[PDB]
Design a protein around this ligand. Sequence first.
Ligand SMILES: Oc1cc(O)cc(/C=C/c2ccc(O)c(O)c2)c1
Ligand SMILES: Oc1cc(O)cc(/C=C/c2ccc(O)c(O)c2)c1
Ligand SMILES: [Fe+2]
Ligand SMILES: [Fe+2]
Lengths: 497, 497
Amino acid sequence: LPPAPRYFQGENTAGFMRPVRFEGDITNLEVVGEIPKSIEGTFYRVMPEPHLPSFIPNDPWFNGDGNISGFYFKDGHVDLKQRYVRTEKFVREAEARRSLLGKYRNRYTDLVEFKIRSTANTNIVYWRGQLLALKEDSPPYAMDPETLETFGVYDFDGQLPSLTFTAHPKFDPVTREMVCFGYEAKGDGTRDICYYSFGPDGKIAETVWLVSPVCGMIHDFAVTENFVIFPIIPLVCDVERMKQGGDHWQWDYSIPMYIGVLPRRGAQGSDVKWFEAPHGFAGHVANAFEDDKGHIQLQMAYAKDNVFFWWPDANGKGPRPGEVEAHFANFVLDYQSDKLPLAEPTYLVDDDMEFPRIDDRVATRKHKHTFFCIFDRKPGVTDFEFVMPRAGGGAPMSNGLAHLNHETGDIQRYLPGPRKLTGECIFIPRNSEAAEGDGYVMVLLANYEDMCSELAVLDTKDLTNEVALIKLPVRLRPGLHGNWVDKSDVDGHPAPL
Amino acid sequence: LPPAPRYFQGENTAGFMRPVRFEGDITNLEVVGEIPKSIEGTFYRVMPEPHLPSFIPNDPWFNGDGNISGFYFKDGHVDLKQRYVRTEKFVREAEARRSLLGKYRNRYTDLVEFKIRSTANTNIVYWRGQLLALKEDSPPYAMDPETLETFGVYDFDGQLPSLTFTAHPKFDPVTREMVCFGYEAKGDGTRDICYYSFGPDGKIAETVWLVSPVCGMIHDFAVTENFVIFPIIPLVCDVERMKQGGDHWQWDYSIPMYIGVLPRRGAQGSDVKWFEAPHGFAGHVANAFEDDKGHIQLQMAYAKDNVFFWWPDANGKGPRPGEVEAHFANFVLDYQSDKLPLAEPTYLVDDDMEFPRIDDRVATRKHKHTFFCIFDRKPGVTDFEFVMPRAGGGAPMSNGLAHLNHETGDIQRYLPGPRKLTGECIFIPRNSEAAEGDGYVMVLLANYEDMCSELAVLDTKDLTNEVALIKLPVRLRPGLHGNWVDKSDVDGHPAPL
Ligand SMILES: Oc1cc(O)cc(/C=C/c2ccc(O)c(O)c2)c1
Ligand SMILES: Oc1cc(O)cc(/C=C/c2ccc(O)c(O)c2)c1
Ligand SMILES: [Fe+2]
Ligand SMILES: [Fe+2]
């Protein structure tokens, strides 16, 4: 077999990116300042964190085993629980005590035959009393919210129609539906998209099979009252390339950024319209909604080149690390229009940004607050001379959060400091009567001075000030998505405004 | 109540001394070099590690909650399991989410009434299929060797005759007895010593009550074929001082270092002889044995002043940090002698040393190998300018190990490096046929450059060279005693030579 290294090597596992691989508990975390005593609930986040050194050199960050952190808050106290998702990969590799799964999304490079290849490492959401650990090439893994025990692969009581489940389902706050899809829904390289939804009782509602113009990556999507919207990243899959040991994904400079629009209820596959936005990278969706005219306002991060630069075009052409910026874009779509080309979007702010969150009490409806990561290259904001030698590689960098008020246009920026970087934030309603966007924001910080992680708690009345800073004595490796589950919400999701 | 701080403050919890407080698992530890594949068994060690910030300022290191590490070795792979002892203190403080126990060994400063005040933080030994987590003011806590679950306070099937159980029992490799004692055996300030032993079937054998000349600290003891030996540290307890909120222990410059000798079998309390060694500090016992003439050779660390300088005499007189050296001393005792004063000991080496280990296959008999920590102040051995600002305070420092061959007088020294310090080592017989002192040595390192811990594996054929270096991504706080439990030993203890 390819040799199994016994320690981690390469930039993607150096410095702050070095795997820790701890599972267990740290109760009664140290706190500087004061956690608001009324906060009650749990912040769950997931990080890729290889349990064993890969036999693939420079294995991408996205291919690491999913490790779940839960921060449990009550009466101004907080405990951490941490546990790996027991994926097929995790379990079989743990049994063998070596890596067996090969290249990202390429089963032809695996050392054994896997049924499920999930690392369950991208998102962790709450649904009907369980956590669902998500990875877009796979079904979810169900987990216990209290103990973080893995129950196993989840198929929604045998109803799951797709081989794949998006890392970005949307929760309709009015209908209490979970709205979902999967791409490559019938296997490697397929252009099949399965759009599907579940009512709050757990029964499947929608199931519509449609066909993508290309086999492209659909990482995120958007949902409005009457439509679902599928933006396609111009990364394209050719299974024949994969069979020869090549990459699942390859950039295509010759195609637009497709944006499919399908009626949300009662549609057939042929009802989808594939609009054509200017060539670019579809980043994360903040939210979409229908305005007065019934036009879709789609607000999302959008770049003009390949953010995933390690998967270049057929001739190896693409950007370098740190070159591509994404901007907060507004696209306008009209399902009734027969004109497929779309205009350039308008931009809501000028910041290099990503990882937008809204108050999910208005998800699928008009929102007027967005919170998001920023990367500000303004001199002094990050001490690069200090940070970069300690940082390792393979993950995006965020050196602040921003809050945009969409009515006033006001922006507040949280800067944790010159030797700290941030993950994706969560928003917590102050209480069940709170106005949209009024409450608390939490975000995990990487502190390169201490080589420790911290959890910051902010009040939305002044995002520039930490009300509390929770000081972890270990590193939590840079991670992906996370979610707040409030104790006052019976189904784990906040009530509509 | 006294306010409960929400983060750690003071030098005793700064830098490398900052509590981490993690419990759980890290499997498949990273390894540089190669762990000998024939090593099979578990290294258990205990560290004091406060679970909650104390309401006592500058609480001594010895007062921290005991946290058990197990390093499980098989076929050149190693896993870490880590868990706090569930003492009464740990559990009640965890329930309250704040410190309740007060000053070291002073119940008059506690915020609630405790039945058992153990932190179980000093030693962790194997006995009849359980671990025993030891603390000299208390009975043992029994734990599961595999899971590190705490069973509870252990009273040896109701046979335990003493309120106290030493952190330093001896295991007779010929008789398979565990030889024990407790001082302050009837409670605070009592001069009662209870000497007791258990056969390999778990039945109590010896039980002898004797009387100390003063209520002094008896941290360690020694066992030979026919005698047990009790060296008394000139720290003395006055309960009236304690009731006014003072220290349990106070140095007394006016007394000798008493060394009691009692016949090992069939004695009465009045059979003890209290010999009087020159005033000094009784450190850890390497081993004792009877020579040809029937004289006791007692080999132990010995200092000429108060190593525990934070407990000075009644007038505050005592040494400063880093001032007191302990030396490897040989005392000669003759139970038949009626002369109580003893001569100054001879010294086996020049090094400032402590934490001696022998090949326990010759415990209570003549040994000719000792392994021990050293602290070399010679310029360059430790980079103090780098280390001391990162070190915190409250714990002893060791910047190498030494192996003394008592026959040849040869010494090898292991120096981990200028920015690393060591804990207490363990010795592992190469196999069941190995000669005395032939095999492997393991020792936990504090790496002040990485602010991480490492576990070093050395071969006794060349102590200067690391065969393997196991790289932990977390800190294990400086700890106290630990033990090897070999898989080939059914009762957990090695076979006699
Ligand atoms: O900084 C960014 C920006 C972005 O727009 C998307 C991502 C992550 C996408 C992703 C895609 C596939 C995976 O398997 C996976 O773990 C993650 C990260
Ligand atoms: O560096 C040294 C040298 C020594 O000779 C003894 C000790 C530890 C003794 C001890 C005494 C009482 C306790 O409660 C405890 O946790 C530890 C540490
Ligand atoms: Fe995402
Ligand atoms: Fe000791």
